[PDB]
Design a protein around this ligand. Structure first.
Ligand SMILES: O=c1ccn([C@@H]2O[C@H](COP(=O)(O)OP(=O)(O)O)[C@@H](O)[C@H]2O)c(=O)[nH]1
Length: 327
């Protein structure tokens, strides 16, 4: 019986679901402490949905007591997301084995998530640490040892004869209507076919004169669109970045917060795409960026290499195999 404890967010829940499924198809009782918006997703994966009140969209550790209502169903191993500190604490109260999942960058002794910002121990890595990226993409991957398992992404339309482009700012920092308007004007009369995810904050009808080569929706099946996409204007979330590599889709990254800037720079230094800072996003800079990487055959070759790295990392299957072997 394995307990999954995670914060309420797609960027943290999505790579977990494929891991839930794999564990369920090997005969483990996967319980999962989430909220309500995520309960149907964990249960489609075959997990035990344990709805709990969060009332939050710093530490806010008023959830451990809410997830303690189940001492009768005490777990044999707790799996918690790095930001989900409740699971880390809970797992130390029962002295139960515990494993850390890294939906973003892994942190060790040489690298820590922080832009020189001091703000008042548990961040030390556990015995096993599953990171949802290949080793080659982890920052300072040479300083990481065998307690970190880089399994890569954890994953579970008619097109035409023209290049297909996907535009999405993720599921959190998507409230930026000026960007969407600039994208429409940037590729209004182009040969590109655009599929743009606008978020639940904007309404497709609101936008005026929607071009015939554009398709705007509040949400979109990213994975399905990435299998036929030729380019992906993204925001630097780890999931979207790793899903683009899995699909072999080069990137234009426009980050909205610090971590996404790390990834944006990471993508740029690996030659997997272009980092276009938010403050430089214009109609012309969007056109120049898309034109720069879409005609760069060498950059595409490096994207194909990172695709192979992503495949070989193992995915949800190798992650579940590592959890079972961890006993
Ligand atoms: O229209 C959309 C927008 C996002 N996603 C998914 O939502 C996640 C985005 O998380 P990411 O870590 O990339 O950024 P965040 O949304 O947490 O900022 C990924 O799994 C995407 O595949 C999706 O399926 N459709």
């Amino acid at each position: 019986h394995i307990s999954m404890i995670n914060i309420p967010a797609y960027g943290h829940v999505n790579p977990t679901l494929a891991l839930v499924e794999k564990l369920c198809e090997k005969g483990h009782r996967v319980t999962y402490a989430t909220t309500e918006e995520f309960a149907p997703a964990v249960q489609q994966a075959g997990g035990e949905a344990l709805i709990y009140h969060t009332s939050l969209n710093e530490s806010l550790s008023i959830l451990p007591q809410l997830e303690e209502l189940y001492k009768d169903d005490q777990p044999d191993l707790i799996i918690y997301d790095f930001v989900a500190l409740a699971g880390k604490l809970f797992a130390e109260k029962l002295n139960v084995p515990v494993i850390k999942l890294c939906s973003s960058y892994a942190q060790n002794e040489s690298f820590q998530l922080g832009n020189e910002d001091m703000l008042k121990q548990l961040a030390v890595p556990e015995a096993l640490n599953i990171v949802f990226m290949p080793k080659s993409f982890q920052i300072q991957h040479e300083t990481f040892d065998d307690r970190f398992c880089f399994v890569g992404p954890s994953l579970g339309i008619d097109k035409d004869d023209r290049p297909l482009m996907l535009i999405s700012l993720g599921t959190a920092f998507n409230a930026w209507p000026e960007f969407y308007k600039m994208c429409i004007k940037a590729f209004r009369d182009s040969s590109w076919q655009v599929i743009m995810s606008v978020g639940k904050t904007i309404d497709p009808e609101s936008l005026e004169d929607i071009p015939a080569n554009f398709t705007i929706r509040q949400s979109v099946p990213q994975l399905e669109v990435l299998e036929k996409a030729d380019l992906f204007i993204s925001h630097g979330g780890m999931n979207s970045t790793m899903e683009a590599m899995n699909a072999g889709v080069p990137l234009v990254v426009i980050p909205q917060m610090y971590e996404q800037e790390l990834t944006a720079n990471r993508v740029d230094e690996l030659g997997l795409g272009v980092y276009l800072p938010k403050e430089e996003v214009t109609v012309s800079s969007l056109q120049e960026a898309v034109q720069a990487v879409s005609s760069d055959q060498e950059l595409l070759s490096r994207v194909k290499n990172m695709q192979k790295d992503v495949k070989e990392a193992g995915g949800a299957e190798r992650a579940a195999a590592e959890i079972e072997a961890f006993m």
